[PDB]
Amino acid sequence: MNQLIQAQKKLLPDLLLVMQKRFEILQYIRLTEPIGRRSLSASLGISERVLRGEVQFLKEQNLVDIKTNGMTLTEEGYELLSVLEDTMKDVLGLTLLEKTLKERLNLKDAIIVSGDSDQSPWVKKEMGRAAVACMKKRFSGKNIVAVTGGTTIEAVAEMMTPDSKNRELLFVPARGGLGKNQANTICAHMAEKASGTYRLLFVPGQLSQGAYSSIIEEPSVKEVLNTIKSASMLVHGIGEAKTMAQRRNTPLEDLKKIDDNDAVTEAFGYYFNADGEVVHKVHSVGMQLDDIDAIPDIIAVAGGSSKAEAIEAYFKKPRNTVLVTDEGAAKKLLR
Amino acid sequence: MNQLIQAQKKLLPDLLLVMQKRFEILQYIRLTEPIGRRSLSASLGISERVLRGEVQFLKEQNLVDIKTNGMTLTEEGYELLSVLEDTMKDVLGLTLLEKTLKERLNLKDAIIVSGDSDQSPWVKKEMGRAAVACMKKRFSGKNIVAVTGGTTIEAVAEMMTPDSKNRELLFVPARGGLGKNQANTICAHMAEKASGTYRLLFVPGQLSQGAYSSIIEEPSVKEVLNTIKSASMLVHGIGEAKTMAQRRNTPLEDLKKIDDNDAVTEAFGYYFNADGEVVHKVHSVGMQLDDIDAIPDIIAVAGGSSKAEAIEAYFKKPRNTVLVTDEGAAKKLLR
Amino acid sequence: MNQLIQAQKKLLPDLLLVMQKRFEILQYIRLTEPIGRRSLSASLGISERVLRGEVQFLKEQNLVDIKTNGMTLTEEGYELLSVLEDTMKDVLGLTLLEKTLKERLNLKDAIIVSGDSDQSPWVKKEMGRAAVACMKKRFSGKNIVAVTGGTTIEAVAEMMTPDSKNRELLFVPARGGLGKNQANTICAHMAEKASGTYRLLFVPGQLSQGAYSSIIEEPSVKEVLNTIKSASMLVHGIGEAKTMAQRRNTPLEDLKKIDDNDAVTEAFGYYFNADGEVVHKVHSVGMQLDDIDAIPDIIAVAGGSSKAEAIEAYFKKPRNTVLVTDEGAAKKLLR
Amino acid sequence: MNQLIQAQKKLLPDLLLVMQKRFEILQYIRLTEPIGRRSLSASLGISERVLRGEVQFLKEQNLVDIKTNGMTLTEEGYELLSVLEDTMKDVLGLTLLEKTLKERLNLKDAIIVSGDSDQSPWVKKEMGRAAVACMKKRFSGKNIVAVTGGTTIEAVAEMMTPDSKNRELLFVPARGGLGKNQANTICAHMAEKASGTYRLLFVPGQLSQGAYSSIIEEPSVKEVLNTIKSASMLVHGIGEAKTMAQRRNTPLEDLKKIDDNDAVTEAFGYYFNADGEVVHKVHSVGMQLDDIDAIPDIIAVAGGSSKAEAIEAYFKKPRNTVLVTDEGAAKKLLR
DNA sequence: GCTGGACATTATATGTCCCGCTATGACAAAAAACGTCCCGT
DNA sequence: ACGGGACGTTTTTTGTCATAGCGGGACATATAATGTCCAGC
């Protein structure tokens, strides 16, 4: 099969280009259906008339249905996306790129989707799709999944679907949250979408450690913290440090600490410098950096060209993590 | 008859109002005939122009004769008035029931919808509808609305619609919540449904007072607590005490306190005995019982036959509150 | 309740008119959803702007949902149609009309829907709705339902829904059919819509009796004929004789017989004169006129002003049948 | 590889054609280099203008050198041609398989789709797709298409689309049917899907020949039978004999006849032995085996490994038929 | 014996715009309701 | 005293339409593919 694909790349690149453009149309319909030719052509970079030619082809092949409210995929369309998913990435050049990103960073594996999410918002949804598919490959019979609360993890929640294998799924918020995109919100949304269950907490924000210790000393609370300690999976974002610290209600004393110690990246309530060393921790009830070592599966979902530096810094140390990212970030990092 | 009227009010919301007004006109004519439009309007406190239109309508229906010396009933009018004497007490067993519930309980007003929500789940939605309509009549130009997190208040949130008058609406959670129906969830849902804004908090549960005091001492937190203190409206549920205490993670020491002091009702984090005296408070960051005095508008939404005793106990003291309830609770309380 | 309704008809006829117009909007949405204000206003006799006022009211009462593809009923809308169904007919004047139609014709009962299906095509769908509801009230634990193949029975099939009581339902074609609206087609469509089962036959048309007798003598065939003989219900149309005979491939000899014997009505393969006496039978394998006597439930579904004479003639003899018809036919017959 | 190619053909229907044509150009250059565009076009029977475009493309892909004295392969070209020698027999195991199936069976042509429909249900839909495309290539200006009623022909009907050339299409049922998948049902569904017209009949089943003769003697009936006799196309299935005879209501006398005469295959109401000789005919009004000779286009659609023996037996005699089948059947037959 | 260049014809894709559908708002105008208030009978 | 008439004001409903997105459709034009033919080196 690899021999066939390599021969096709030399003898039929003109045909491979048409196929990729038509495959991209099917992916964007899967994301946004039902959608009409005006909105879909605008969403891609192409004229209504060019799209209308391609969509009429796809309808004739019974891959899309065209109704008064727009276009949706047929069963054959959904099947085709699953069958061609991996080989299409070989010609998109993502395969070689993922190999190299894994040589460069401390990564268990790299999953890169097309595009730059800083330019093309829907790319966050494709990272979401990819992350969900990755989660499902790693689930055991029973699972406790800890999640953070940022907008990329929200995109993972939005793309979550029930598990075909019906494995047991309990979701909890490792980050606790700061303000509606708080880990509790995400945790619940992801569980509803997966037909799983979930457990919840309070918003930590920034407070005296003694106040957190009293919450930690509490029983019904302790039960949720022990569940978080037992997490089998962590799904988290990676942010720019300054962006995260200004978005939160960071005390002026801690802003100065964060700046003076040259923080560049943020993940699950910690700020790290360019060498991936912790420089500040926003105290929260729940997961600690030392706890990630014992979690079998960690999936970081983060992309966009603006995050290349943060992503590089975070993975300057081994994290035993699979990264789901996009070309925006990966190409900027690697060239 | 109750079922028919409840269906008819969906198409004709002030059906009972028109019925009652026309019935009163016919009663007053039977008492004073012949009487003219000037005397009849004055006696009923209706504008002459409105009364003149209604009696001209009744004359077209052959119920009243309009002659040189004024108005008298027809044969048809006397017969109809005799039929309405029987029906209309059954037609208006409600304005009668609400009048009596307000004589019995400490209530600013009573709003009672048909049915028993313990038997007929959709009755919770009609309490919701009624509560929303009540809220909108009480809004000022600017509003801070504090809400609790129980399933009946959830029903109020589900029926919330944007304000026709576009008054300013900020929602906050007075109860803070305990576990997905936490006041924060409700508060947000209600704000989205109203196209208002909202502010949020952490879940208190049961914890040491000192831990809460540290959260109270905090700044970005203090701002939300001060907003709650400035509430112009409170919308809250009323629960059975034992049900509420067992649903929560109540400490065994506090369960014994609650039982030993004969708590029967619960509202906004307080348990009260049969005389409406506080017997226990689940400590929470936010509203205190003493704070309700200063809130201009308080609406309690609670019904079902199982809550009759709790509702009676809660209103054994003046609360300056409008109660939205159902026949389930009201009829069980009053007979 | 009857006292309340009679008082409402005298005191509130202006309010009853508004309610009926809004109820008619809900009925036509149930039939055609999703539908938009341009198509729905045209379907009724009213301007887009008048409809838009009423539909905005219905949305505010949570009886309809308005989406990009048009309007549908909410749960509350479907419920309201079931609760008000019978009382709305009292003011539509259908109750008095049905009483009189049953005094005039040989009828077990009369069910009359509004309108004239000759003028307003959707009236055939409301006869369909009414017939289905009637069938479901008469089902026993086990049912064999024989059906004819005309366009009004097709409308019954289109409105068929699964039985809430999950009674056993087997459908068969009593008429056998003549040409795509053949009883076999209807029989199958009705069974699929009811989640029942069905058995089938060949199209008789017009042929020598001996050819039919050979088909009757056959075994796998005999089993279906015996099933038809065991029918617990018959659902059939009533047609004008000349229309039915010309639509079919009637032999010229039989056309002359039909004309010369003054046939005026047709039902299940028989032509009858003005006194309801058989004058000609299109020979078919299956049900015979003598067999209807032994069928517990017979429902005739037929309407439109053009059928008044045929309907009157058919019921000049006792048929122990419930007629589902429309005002078109009923008012023309009775005045 | 089979799965990848089948997916790729949905986006690029003549992928294998382009592949093969480019492979042949490279083979012919390796044999004759240096060779010019006039000689190479002549030798391959391709127009000089088309060949010139393909070799200019191959030169841009660095596979061929175009010099004053003509064209030679590059290093890359020799390597690619060596890879394609291995792949392309696996890439084109099909045009090879169809060639061989046509050497083995009595076939006008063979069309084989990937997979085994006994294992993979969707393979019946791809046979359907292929059969429709074949039908459309054979249509004349006016067409009478006779069809049988089995589940594979149903799959052909489901994939039917209107004719791009808008040729005239009338469909009729050659098989008449036995029980909802009766030829009449299929015939109608196919006509609706093609925007054609159709004519229909009764279900023959098994009956005395004299009863059929009376139906044959009839006029409006005779017109449909004469239309079937005028068929320009027949589209039929092929079944296992025992399966077909047990599915129908076969008389015990005829089952014994079918068994005792070693029937193995069934098509259009006839059972045949392993040598393709008729051993029993289920009498039906319509097409007879002798009639197929006069039909210009016959397309048999049948596949799955369980039908290999039936398919082989049916085509032991010349039928002037194009077979649409799958690898399931073809590979089992040929190895 | 070939390179590229090229001209006339035929086929396919594209641009443009189009009519007939669905939702939100939005301004103007007409009708209805109403608050007093006039007279004669 | 009481009803009919009525005028000015206020409130509510209606008419007209306005546009983005949804489709299948039509007409015109451009771009490309194709079928040969051109020269000299």
Residue numbers in the entry:
A (entry chain C), B (entry chain A), C (entry chain B), D (entry chain D): 1 to 179, 183 to 338
Provide the authors' original text about this structure.
The SorC family of transcriptional regulators plays a crucial role in controlling the carbohydrate metabolism and quorum sensing. A typical SorC protein comprises an N-terminal DNA-binding domain (DBD) of a helix–turn–helix (HTH) motif, along with a C-terminal Rossmann-like fold effector-binding domain (EBD). SorC repressors generally form tetramers as they bind to their operators located in promoter regions of regulated genes.
CggR functions as a repressor of the hexacistronic gapA operon encoding CggR itself and five crucial enzymes involved in the triose phosphate interconversion during glycolysis. We determined the structure of CggR bound to the complete DNA operator, referred to here as OLR. The DNA duplex OLR contains the full-length operator sequence of 45 bp, located between positions +32 and +77 relative to the transcription start point of the gapA operon. Our 2D particle classification indicates that, when bound to DNA, CggR forms a tetrameric assembly with a global C2 symmetry. The C2 symmetry was clearly apparent also in the reconstructed map refined without enforcing any symmetry, and the final 3D reconstruction using 220146 particles was therefore refined with C2 symmetry to a resolution of 4.3 Å (statistics in Table 2). Each monomer of CggR contains an N-terminal two-β-stranded wHTH motif with an extension of a C-terminal helix followed by a C-terminal effector-binding domain that shares great homology with other members of the SorC family. The dimerization is mediated through DNA-binding domains, predominantly through a swap of the N-terminal α1 helices. Two CggR dimers come together to form a tetrameric assembly via an interaction between the EBDs of the two neighboring dimers. The interaction of CggR with DNA is mediated by DBD dimers, each interacting with one half-operator, wedging into two consecutive major grooves. The conformation of the operator DNA is significantly affected by CggR binding and exhibits a profound bend in the regions contacted by DBD dimers. Another noteworthy feature of the bound DNA is the apparent kink in the middle of the DNA duplex, where the central minor groove, flanked by the DBD dimers, is substantially widened.
